[PDB]
Write a protein that binds this ligand. Structure first.
Ligand SMILES: Nc1nc2c(ncn2[C@@H]2O[C@H](COP(=O)(O)OP(=O)(O)OP(=O)(O)O)[C@@H](O)[C@H]2O)c(=O)[nH]1
Ligand SMILES: Nc1nc2c(ncn2[C@@H]2O[C@H](COP(=O)(O)OP(=O)(O)O)[C@@H](O)[C@H]2O)c(=O)[nH]1
Ligand SMILES: Nc1nc2c(ncn2[C@@H]2O[C@H](COP(=O)(O)OP(=O)(O)O)[C@@H](O)[C@H]2O)c(=O)[nH]1
Ligand SMILES: [Mg+2]
Lengths: 127, 430, 426, 6, 48, 437
């Protein structure tokens, strides 16, 4: 290219990431496929069953690890992921005194065995 | 035994619903995977292995907000089918969400809501989360609710609608979607509560010591209100409050079913460190115009009825002493035909907070549900905004091109007029 | 999931599109070989919007390249990122138009249209849920204005219930580089008013003034101008491929910014443009952006909104921030400038916030404005057209091609009632 | 199963 | 490298040296693939 | 277990057959020496279809090679794969055909076919039971048309209940090679209608268009022409030699594609065809292979399919693939082009699936089409016939060998009716009302 047409406002190389603190994210770059020839001849003869289109490989979030990468970042890059960050350090313990139950169903109703019409026999200790 | 199905529609419903279902899981001690480390029966279904499935249905016409739910921390908590996703968003068009796109998915959501109600031995009601601005939150929920009224006869239905504020707005065509949907909710609803964005912005900036609030911060506070409403089904109390009964004391007429919800106290941890909070001032904080969450001043109107929900260590004696103080104060004005307009309710369990949240640990909290004559001013400015749009045919061709006939714009406006004259007819003394 | 097809008409649209495919491959972390070298699982979560999968883990653009001379794509193929394209999407003729709208629309442009519609139909059929189209052209050339107006006329009648947008390099008064540009522009805007959902006007005078007064660049070459255009063009479709708090796609913007079907010409803008020496002293906040955003020196077109009235305002925000300051500041500029906005539309401004910023910056913003200031651009084009047409100049290169004289009066009448329609709403 | 090359 | 040159070739080819260069490149690529496949057929290799 | 006897006649038939035996020996892993060098076990499970086991564990083809001129099979046996053929299968006469149908069918061909049928009888009575016959010829020359149709007539008389399949190279209007070609084409299609069950018409112009536009070769010489035919060759009978999910042999194709006993002219097609510069940039998908089926640019017969209606379509797929996207794409094509398929025949397309794709490829497929658009090929031959016939041109080389005048009139009449059933069935309506108005 001519030096007159060349400008230094935006020079983009093949995308190299600096150390992980330089990026917007906290992670180094993926290596990807190192051999173009292997990429273009060593394909898959098998077809995976869940993919309605073999073109769209990641059809519905197939093998994308965005969840634990949000957990790995100290603060998420998505504001929708702020909700579940602070769950596994609690502040107050749970109070379980004032909880409704079904004592009518737990005491009055029983399943089977008809205890009235049999001799007690084995394992009846008087109360 | 008691239970309620919650449905979230639109981007507002999904982004308010993940914050609700966080608060529910922390309140019941349920891990995100769905296993405990019988008060949960109103919001969860049991699996024989022991996993708890929430009875929530998430519906939206775009996958941008459902995908973060399917890839968020609550991926395995929810059912993989209850997160229903359409093809194309309505794009703030009532006509697109009611006539062209919403008809494709209505059979699917009705199929799941019938399956989820087949587990219901006896059902209390429905909870609907939507906003009046967006196309999915307005156009889709109009056909869904009228088809729900056809399918289910006299099951109670509760809305938590988000209102376009008088000053701020996120879109231009919002008064169109608001008028044509409140037309539908006027006759096809049991009760609907109003929540404004701008007032909660003022509450968060003033009392809560936050200069930079977020949509994540609003959704916790409104989530605490819904937990306060449904507290008495889960937990015992001195005066248990059921869904059919605070719906009994709040509708004087079939036409008027639009209460306002306020929460108290809502302050930071440093403020709660110095100021003690007894029962007398937390119910005094309920009627303050500087503390209400709807952009209207009740001093221009009169109170029709009031319902009070209390949590924690609240004595039945001093709440009655506090109510007599509110009744004898001259500024609070009631109608002459309703001498007893109050209802109280006590629950024993104090409210919970979430880590990383804002609200402090407080012994007692109170939620006030008020019917006010002054709310017609909010309908007055939006009606004036609506006819100012319609006087020069603004954004009409976008609605018309979907198969929407022109006369419903005038039909909704005259019914909104008839709602105003019916509202003005009651607030005169005999 | 939602699919947009790219088209590049004319030489000017080719280098703009080549720069456009360079900056979004960088945004998605695509190596110029074609593989993926990225650092986010959000980059690959929605990458099919602009790309088609190749077998074994390669991504190719969903674009077609048309012109009348094969010499243009020889530079495009030999460019820095020219090896990612599909070698069967390149459709070209043999004889050029020579900046003649008649040649590109009637005689010569009628043969390549029968060969390119097979390619664009094959590409649109391959995707499942096609959202719409996008194409870039210039009105100062025969190829970009001649066959581009015929390309949109045939696509509109073949795909009626869709959406698209054009990116048009509008001719400018003092940097007019061709003596027949008023004839090329007038006969193309008449095709655009009824057959286009969204039109974005780019003026070469404004792009020169951006680098002269704000970027302070001593050599603002065409590579810098196209990067400026591509930066404000990649931001309008961010919410399709990145999640955010307030999602807004192309249909969302069109239904709010178009109040009448004949009013769809928009003036773009890019907020975080800052010079070299002043980047250090400029402290990145939200109310900063909206102060620079509404500055008339930061506009993409050579029209001053102070002479006009603002119809509707679109502002999409990039990056992680909270938007109480977005909502408060944009109320402040609406209440302060009461006489600069229409009174028959309260709440003139629509906001949208997306979580993912552009590379290298915490935040960015893109401004889309509808105003009556564009009627001055239309009336100066019309008055140059009727001055050229009064003395019957350059008519032997058009009337000899097989097209009559009455269409010039038809296009003049279409310009007459368009500026009358813009004036009566003011 | 053996390759031989001249 | 040879395929990079091949895709760096122009889109319209009518000159005799251009056709000769294209055919020479194509035969080179075919023979390169033949050798790579012959080597990649099996793991252990004996030579005469 | 079902053997196929291959016949090669004429110069064009011998060169295509030499390319055909090269392709399927590469498929079955047979080196040019004659032994077996393969890696899999499924290559050998069905090998007796095309080959005979000989002494020393060698395999020889079940093919006979005939020609009236001797010079061609010297080039055949000097080719890369010409040393596998046994020498006693080469049968040659003495004098050339002369591009004369009378010489190839009556005078020179009469003495030679008595020796040709001797070798064919020895080969067919060495099979377990025969499945069918396959012949490669061209209608332009004298040996391919004259002797080629005589071998069809005598074998069909001797074996009445068999399957007869032929691959014929039809003449072309613009690249036409022989001046006397419309005479030999007219005098041979009559014989091919009565005594054949499948006829596969291949045109040189349509394959030139395939090589120029799709394959994009600077020099696609006759080695590349015959290889594309040989790829279509092996796709028809890949079911008899390899297992698959859905099996369909030649008799399955015979019953399903022939609605009436004189409607058996099909156009061929080979699906996966990529250029070398775009081998790497495009996805080999079942939606793509279905899309590359029905385009008019991929046909090997130079007739526009959009001028007619598809009576019956056959598609034979190869490779590991589920059949839902196969079934969904066939239903999508039939639904979108409703006017281009015959209304009174539902489900015009038959599907066949095999499990062994060709060598060096992921998936492959073969398209066969019974269409009414082939009537333009027959009417352009008859018009070329009648115009040349009206001045009695070039007839003294035909009437000098013992032919009469009226055979030319009969063949024209049978071409005139043959396009008449094509035309009335194209204009046939499902209900008898709506026409005759
Ligand atoms: N209070 C509150 N309102 C919200 C929240 N999220 C979205 N909204 C409301 O949603 C309205 C705009 O609708 P959208 O964001 O487009 O969502 P939608 O209802 O699905 O509409 P579409 O996306 O077009 O289908 C805004 O006016 C907000 O008031 C939230 O988290 N809290
Ligand atoms: N903004 C911008 N404008 C350009 C660029 N290159 C050319 N132009 C404009 O395009 C006009 C010439 O258009 P032309 O190339 O003839 O259009 P075509 O005939 O369709 O190819 C000139 O007036 C330039 O101002 C560019 O890189 N950026
Ligand atoms: N496709 C193709 N056609 C061929 C080939 N060789 C000859 N032909 C055709 O055969 C025709 C001449 O047939 P001819 O050799 O005279 O037949 P014969 O006299 O019976 O041997 C010409 O029109 C050629 O187009 C070949 O290798 N491939
Ligand atoms: Mg939505």
């Amino acid at each position: 290219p001519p030096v007159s047409a060349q400008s230094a406002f935006s020079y983009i190389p093949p995308r190299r990431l600096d150390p992980k603190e330089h990026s917007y994210y906290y992670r180094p770059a993926r290596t990807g496929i190192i051999s173009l020839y292997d990429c273009i001849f060593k394909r898959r003869l098998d077809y995976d069953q869940k993919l309605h289109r073999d073109d769209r490989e990641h059809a519905k979030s197939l093998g994308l690890h965005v969840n634990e990468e949000e957990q790995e970042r100290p603060v998420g890059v998505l504001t929708s992921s702020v909700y579940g960050k602070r769950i596994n350090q609690p502040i107050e313990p749970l109070n379980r005194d004032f909880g409704r139950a079904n004592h009518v169903q737990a005491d009055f109703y029983r399943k089977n065995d008809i205890p009235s019409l049999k001799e007690p026999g084995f394992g009846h200790i008087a109360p | 035994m008691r239970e309620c199905i919650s449905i979230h529609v639109g981007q507002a419903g999904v982004q308010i619903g993940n914050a609700c279902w966080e608060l529910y899981c922390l309140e019941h001690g349920i891990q995100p995977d769905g296993q405990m480390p019988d008060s949960f029966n109103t919001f969860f279904s049991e699996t024989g292995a022991g996993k708890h499935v929430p009875r929530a249905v998430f519906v939206d016409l775009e996958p941008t907000v459902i995908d973060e739910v399917r890839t968020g921390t609550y991926r395995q908590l929810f059912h993989p089918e209850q997160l229903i996703t359409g093809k194309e968003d309505a794009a703030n068009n009532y006509a697109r969400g009611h006539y062209t796109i919403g008809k494709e998915i209505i059979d699917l959501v009705l199929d799941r809501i019938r399956k989820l109600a087949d587990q219901c031995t006896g059902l209390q009601g429905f909870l609907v989360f939507h906003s009046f601005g967006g196309g999915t939150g307005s156009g889709f929920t109009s056909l869904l609710m009228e088809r729900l009224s056809v399918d289910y006869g006299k099951k109670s239905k509760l809305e938590f609608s988000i209102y376009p504020a008088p000053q701020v707005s996120t879109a231009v065509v919002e008064p169109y979607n608001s008028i044509l949907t409140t037309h539908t909710t006027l006759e096809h609803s049991d009760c609907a509560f109003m929540v404004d964005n701008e007032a909660i912005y003022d509450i968060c900036r003033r009392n809560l010591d936050i200069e930079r609030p977020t949509y994540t911060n609003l959704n916790r506070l409104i989530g605490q209100i819904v937990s306060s409403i449904t507290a008495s089904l889960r937990f015992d109390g001195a005066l248990n409050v059921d869904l059919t009964e605070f719906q009994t004391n709040l509708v004087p007429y079939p036409r008027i079913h639009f209460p306002l919800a306020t929460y108290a106290p809502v302050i930071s941890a440093e403020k709660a460190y110095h100021e003690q909070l007894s029962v007398a001032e937390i119910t005094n904080a309920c009627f303050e115009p500087a503390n209400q969450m709807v952009k209207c001043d009740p001093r221009h109107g009169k109170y029709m009825a009031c319902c009070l929900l209390y949590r924690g260590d609240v004595v039945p004696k001093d709440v009655n002493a506090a109510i007599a103080t509110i009744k004898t104060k001259r500024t609070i004005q009631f109608v002459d035909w309703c001498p007893t307009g109050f209802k109280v309710g006590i629950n024993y369990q104090p409210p919970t907070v979430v880590p990383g949240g804002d609200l402090a640990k407080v012994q007692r909290a109170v939620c006030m549900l008020s019917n006010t004559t002054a709310i017609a001013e909010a309908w007055a400015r939006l009606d004036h905004k609506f006819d100012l749009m319609y006087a020069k045919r603004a954004f009409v061709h976008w609605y018309v091109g979907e198969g929407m006939e022109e006369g419903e714009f005038s039909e909704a406006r005259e019914d909104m007029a008839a709602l105003e004259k019916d509202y003005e007819e009651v607030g005169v003394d005999s | 999931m939602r699919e947009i097809v790219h088209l590049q008409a004319g030489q000017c649209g080719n280098q703009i599109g080549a720069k456009f495919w360079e900056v979004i491959s960088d945004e998605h972390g695509i190596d110029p070989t074609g593989t993926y070298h990225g650092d986010s699982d959000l980059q690959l979560e929605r990458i099919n919007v602009y790309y088609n999968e190749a077998t074994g883990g390669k991504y190719v653009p969903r674009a077609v390249l048309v012109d009348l001379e094969p010499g243009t794509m020889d530079s495009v193929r030999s460019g820095p990122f020219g090896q990612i394209f599909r070698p069967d999407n390149f459709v070209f003729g043999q004889s050029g138009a020579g900046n003649n709208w008649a040649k590109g629309h009637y005689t010569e442009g009628a043969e390549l249209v029968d060969s390119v519609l097979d390619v664009v139909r094959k590409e649109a059929e391959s995707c499942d849920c096609l959202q719409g189209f996008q194409l870039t052209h210039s009105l100062g050339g025969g190829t970009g204005s001649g066959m581009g107006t015929l390309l949109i006329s045939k696509i509109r009648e073949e795909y009626p219930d869709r959406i698209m947008n054009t990116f048009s390099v509008v001719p400018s008064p003092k940097v007019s580089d061709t003596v027949v540009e008023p004839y090329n522009a007038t006969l193309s805007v008449h095709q655009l008013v009824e057959n286009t959902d969204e039109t974005y006007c780019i003026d070469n005078e404004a792009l020169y003034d951006i680098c002269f007064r704000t970027l302070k660049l001593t050599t603002p070459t065409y590579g810098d101008l196209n990067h400026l255009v591509s930066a404000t063009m990649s931001g309008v479709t961010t919410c399709l491929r990145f999640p955010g708090q307030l999602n807004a796609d192309l249909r969302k913007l069109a239904v709010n910014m178009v109040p009448f079907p004949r009013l769809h010409f928009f003036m773009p803008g890019f907020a975080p443009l800052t010079s070299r020496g002043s980047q250090q002293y400029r402290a990145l906040t939200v109310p900063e952006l909206t102060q620079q955003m509404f500055d008339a020196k930061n506009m993409m077109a050579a029209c001053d909104p102070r002479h006009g009235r603002y119809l509707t305002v679109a502002a999409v925000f990039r990056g992680r921030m909270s938007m109480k300051e977005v909502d408060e500041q944009m109320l402040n500029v609406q209440n302060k400038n009461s006489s600069y906005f229409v009174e028959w539309i309260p709440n003139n401004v629509k906001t949208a916030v997306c979580d993912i910023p552009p590379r290298g910056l915490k935040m960015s913003a893109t401004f889309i404005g509808n105003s009556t200031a564009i009627q001055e651009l239309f009336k100066r084009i019309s008055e140059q057209f009727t001055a050229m047409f009064r003395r019957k100049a350059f008519l032997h290169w058009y009337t000899g091609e097989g097209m009559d004289e009455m269409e010039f009066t038809e296009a003049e009448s279409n310009m007459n009632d368009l500026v009358s329609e813009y004036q009566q709403y003011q | 199963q053996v390759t031989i090359i001249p | 490298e040879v395929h990079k040159e091949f895709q760096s070739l122009s889109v319209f080819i009518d000159s005799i040296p251009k056709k000769i260069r294209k055919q020479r490149l194509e035969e080179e690529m075919k023979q390169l693939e033949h050798d790579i496949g012959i080597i990649e057929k099996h793991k252990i290799i004996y030579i005469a």
